[PDB]
Symmetry: C3
């Protein structure tokens, strides 16, 4: 009666506190990922993943440490630094990370997270001779993440990092006058040395900016939850004919 209560409260607290630590830990993975990719440090990125982890980029799946090192190292690091750990003279790749919404499973062994990034990228004039031809000298980019996390032996890791690029703009023209200089993946590893292990099913392939596709929310409506229905609200607005 007296003790059963004290027990109850300590179980209810340990559960709530673990959850609060879990949210901190999972956000911490995404922010750390950001600081590493800003420095073209593919080794630190690879280490964030479970050994069966997957990263998705331009609708291509890169599998395990090897696939992550292939995306961030073989492709990105050679593209931006010619294969040096950054940062390096004149090379900007700032992926500002924000707006985390993390949903931890009730059992505390898996989670989802929505995040986004805005990238300021480019070669200063002093290092412009190092830039490849198929890339603007300076650009903006933004993307959404809907990631999966696994608590593996009590340690939060990235199960699935799914970066969906939403738009790019050349600094000089902006998003309104710029077509994405990246297209859905076509050729897999090993045919393509920069390529993914697998391409997503045909239906799920994202065409790039200006094309848009909904990235569905991993998180439930945070007030109405499962009780939220669009059609309970739509009738209150008026649709106009132009």
């Amino acid at each position: 009666h007296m003790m059963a209560d004290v027990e109850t409260r300590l179980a209810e607290l340990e559960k709530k506190v673990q959850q609060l630590e879990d949210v901190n830990a999972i956000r911490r993975l995404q922010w750390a990922y950001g600081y590493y990719i800003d420095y073209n440090r593919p080794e630190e990125v690879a280490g964030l993943f479970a050994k069966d982890g997957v990263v998705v980029f331009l609708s291509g799946e890169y599998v395990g440490y090897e696939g992550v090192m292939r995306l961030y190292g073989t492709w990105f690091q050679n593209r931006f630094t010619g294969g040096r750990r950054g940062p390096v003279h004149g090379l900007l790749l700032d992926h500002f990370q924000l707006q985390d919404i993390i949903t931890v499973a009730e059992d505390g062994q898996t989670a989802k997270g929505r995040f986004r990034g805005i990238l300021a990228g480019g070669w200063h004039d002093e290092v412009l001779h190092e830039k490849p031809d198929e890339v603007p000298q300076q650009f903006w980019e933004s993307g959404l993440y809907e990631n999966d996390y696994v608590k593996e032996d009590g340690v939060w890791k990235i199960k699935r990092l799914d970066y969906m690029m939403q738009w790019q703009g050349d600094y000089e023209t902006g998003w309104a006058h710029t077509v994405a200089h990246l297209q859905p993946a076509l050729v897999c590893y090993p045919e393509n040395p920069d390529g993914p292990d697998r391409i997503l099913p045909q239906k799920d392939v994202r065409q790039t900016w200006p094309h848009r596709y909904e990235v569905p929310m991993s998180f439930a409506h945070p007030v109405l939850g499962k009780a939220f229905m669009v059609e309970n609200f739509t009738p209150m607005m008026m649709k106009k004919e132009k």
Copy 2:
């Protein structure tokens, strides 16, 4: 003596843990609000509010689900998507949300929150024929929020969302060469179908960029609190005559 202590500690913890959950929940409302308005989904936004909730935009009060659906649906959704739930081809409305400072009431039934947003907005050339005339093709905007929250039947909701736009810049000219294309609200609903239920008192009406007005901090100085006084520090600097 022994048990009274154990009780004390469990009361002191349950209080601290609830607070930590409350901060997470309130930030979660603002970040969720962001993802919905990026998609021109006024129904999800309306659902975040208490039924006597208020949103303030350009010094106009929109009251309840109806008023929120009138701002985000009748006005914004028709303006940006011609009345479709987004996202849609070529239409960018990314309101990057950050820098939350949340102050929960001691009793845990109300809160305040300061937040801000920076908006990258526009129509790609491919959908430029859908853009209304009174709006730049592509622009930056930023604003501050000082919001009120109500824990209504143990559930955090928006009592008052007060977006105060601070500046806009056409992508091509930037903030320094751009006058706000939005002005303080003048005409109320029902006269104006896009209009607010009420306009703020005359004294409180904000003129727009380049005009600036302080948005006072909802949060106390986080080191000195109520002990903070400006005039204890001012004498240490030197004012210069130009």
Copy 3:
């Protein structure tokens, strides 16, 4: 046996909860710092510091309330507002603050924090006559913070704020065509009225954009920790010869 357990759990919880409060409190210092510097309010900034606190700007150390008021007041406030507490007509100085990674000491009396800022800055045409000559009318800037915190009489304060500017871009040309208009500090107070008390050792002086230098991470690899080694991952990528 029964009670020793209950004790154990309450000690283990009080420790975990204090940590969660500490992370909130330390982030809160950086976000509050942001809102104050956006308003050219050097008094609120000074109050965030321990009395032996230090701020580092362009490789110069400003010591104590006086040194902070000298940086943010005597220098910055006169430069941007001619010595008025902001905000003021036509003057933009929005330092968007994000991507906090906080590491609290095991004993809970000191912490480190990595953060970053992106600054949208400038004078509208209407106040362009107030701008000094050595500054672009409108610009972007970004920087990294690796700060130290001290829990002084149970109250979190800034021990060391170390802003390392990473890049600037004139709005009209962007980061790729812009050299930093700020250089490493050369002349100390009192010779220089805007100058720092001390300049960092010669070795540690940062040259500015386009020059880049690593800002080492205050935080351990958040999955592998001390077990993380670069050379365990590098062999998995391929270095390419161009």
